[PDB]
Structure 1
């Protein structure tokens, strides 16, 4: 029923995440990168996470959220190639 044995986190296997979409090349508005699911907001390049900063770039495409609270889950403001 409950949970016992004063223990912390619960484990299993190896993570199933990747680094798809380095971004500096074309990219249709879709989930750039993969780690955890369910998240929206970013509609372009919005790599911004606590640290030395983050980035992405060039690619004119309406929308394009991130994975979730990970590699810059925050939603910055627009960005395209330079001249789409």
Structure 2
């Protein structure tokens, strides 16, 4: 065969889903590009990894001019 190669899988996705209680610093979404965006009390690291900046429940929203998915946290 000419090919027969592949990389190791990266385990990317929504780790904590909407409504779930998360602790301050908990990773909510591992992904490549900002598919989801950082809302209230949610960060965005160098890897575009969205993480909780406060102890609370995760909230998925669909707002903005371009209709993007945002992840917020509400205590």
TM-score (norm 1): 0.23
Deviates more, 1:59-68 or 1:73-82: 59-68
**For structure 2, which runs of at least 5 residues remain unmatched after alignment?**
none
Deviation at 1:20, TM superposition (A): 4.4
Greater Rg, structure 1 or structure 2? Answer: 1
Aligned residues: 75
Misfit runs of 4+, over 3 Å? 25-41, 43-76
Per-residue displacement from partner, 1:22-62 (whole Å, max 9, x unpaired)?
Answer: 42189999999999999964164699999999999984469
* Coordinate RMSD, CA, aligned: 11.8
Q: Greater strand share, 1 or 2?
A: 2
**For structure 1, which runs of at least 5 residues remain unmatched after alignment?**
1-8
